[PDB]
Amino acid sequence: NQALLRILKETEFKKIKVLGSGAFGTVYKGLWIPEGEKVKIPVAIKELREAKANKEILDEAYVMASVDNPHVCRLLGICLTSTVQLIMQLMPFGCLLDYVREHKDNIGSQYLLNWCVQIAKGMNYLEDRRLVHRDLAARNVLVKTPQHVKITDFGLAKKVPIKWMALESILHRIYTHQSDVWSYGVTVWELMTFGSKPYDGIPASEISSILEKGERLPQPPICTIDVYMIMRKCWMIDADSRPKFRELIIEFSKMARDPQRYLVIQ
Numbered sequence: 001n002q003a004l005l006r007i008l009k010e011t012e013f014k015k016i017k018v019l020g021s022g023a024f025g026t027v028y029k030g031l032w033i034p035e036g037e038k039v040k041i042p043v044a045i046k047e048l049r050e051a052k053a054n055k056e057i058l059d060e061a062y063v064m065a066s067v068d069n070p071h072v073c074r075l076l077g078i079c080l081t082s083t084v085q086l087i088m089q090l091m092p093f094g095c096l097l098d099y100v101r102e103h104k105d106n107i108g109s110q111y112l113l114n115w116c117v118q119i120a121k122g123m124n125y126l127e128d129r130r131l132v133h134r135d136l137a138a139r140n141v142l143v144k145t146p147q148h149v150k151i152t153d154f155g156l157a158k159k160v161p162i163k164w165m166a167l168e169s170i171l172h173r174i175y176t177h178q179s180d181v182w183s184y185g186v187t188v189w190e191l192m193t194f195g196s197k198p199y200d201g202i203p204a205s206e207i208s209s210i211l212e213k214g215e216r217l218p219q220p221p222i223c224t225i226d227v228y229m230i231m232r233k234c235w236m237i238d239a240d241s242r243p244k245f246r247e248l249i250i251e252f253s254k255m256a257r258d259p260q261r262y263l264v265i266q
């Protein structure tokens, strides 16, 4: 479906401001000024590091532009020059990890459980589209509005987040939808701890042996045993025994109908 992805001319958008840079590239806050339409759209522009053929890039960009789910970021446009520039709608509240750290004192049980539902819905859609994320984390969930979050940075792989990866991904480089469930459990742990680092102070070289010994991320103080058991099942060695994203939508949606029963916050 070629119409889903806009191939942007360099004149159609302007990098107004830097939002942040990392190893993979620089993200800008900018304006989309489409040719012959008399509007100015605020957008985010990620310029990847200058590195892979144009046809291969566009083929993956077409997949990113074809997602149609309220909790999955959609690629609005792309510009192919010396670099690859990805254009999508601006998420003004930033990533969910920075958001919970900034607003920890003002976040209640309903907000946290609703986020777990929306993230599970976005992942279930990615699984139904036969897409594996391979990097699900609180940093890769963007906040459009405080109660509308979207998953991003999926399919960009086309160093390694050891502390978010399932054991079979660390030791065997196996990436499946059930390996995304492990990362989902860690993502939930980030939110329930209001943005704490998983396995803080432990080198990534030792994470595999820690998981082999049976140690997992500790129970966040606000989580009841029902919430923590669901997180613990996401970290099972047998990937087939971990919950599916479909079941994760159902359990957290029922918990969201009575949030104070499952999360104890001051």
Ligand SMILES: *CCC(=O)Nc1cc(-c2c[nH]c3ncnc(Nc4ccc(OCc5ccccn5)c(Cl)c4)c23)ccc1OCCN(C)C
Pocket (backbone or CB within 6 Å): 019, 020, 021, 022, 027, 044, 045, 046, 064, 073, 074, 075, 076, 086, 087, 088, 089, 090, 091, 092, 093, 094, 095, 096, 097, 098, 138, 139, 140, 142, 151, 152, 153, 154
């Ligand atoms: C958790 C910290 C963080 O994420 N920081 C961060 C946030 C943004 C950012 C803020 N507001 C935004 N609105 C919209 N988009 C972004 N950032 C992104 C992310 C991915 C992008 O393309 C990938 C993609 C596009 C479509 C579908 C799937 N995947 C784009 Cl184009 C924009 C955003 C921006 C930058 C940062 O941090 C950057 C460097 N950090 C130090 C890691």
Ligand SMILES: [Cl-]
Pocket (backbone or CB within 6 Å): 022
């Ligand atoms: Cl990023």
Ligand SMILES: [Mg+2]
Pocket (backbone or CB within 6 Å): 139, 140, 153
């Ligand atoms: Mg990112």
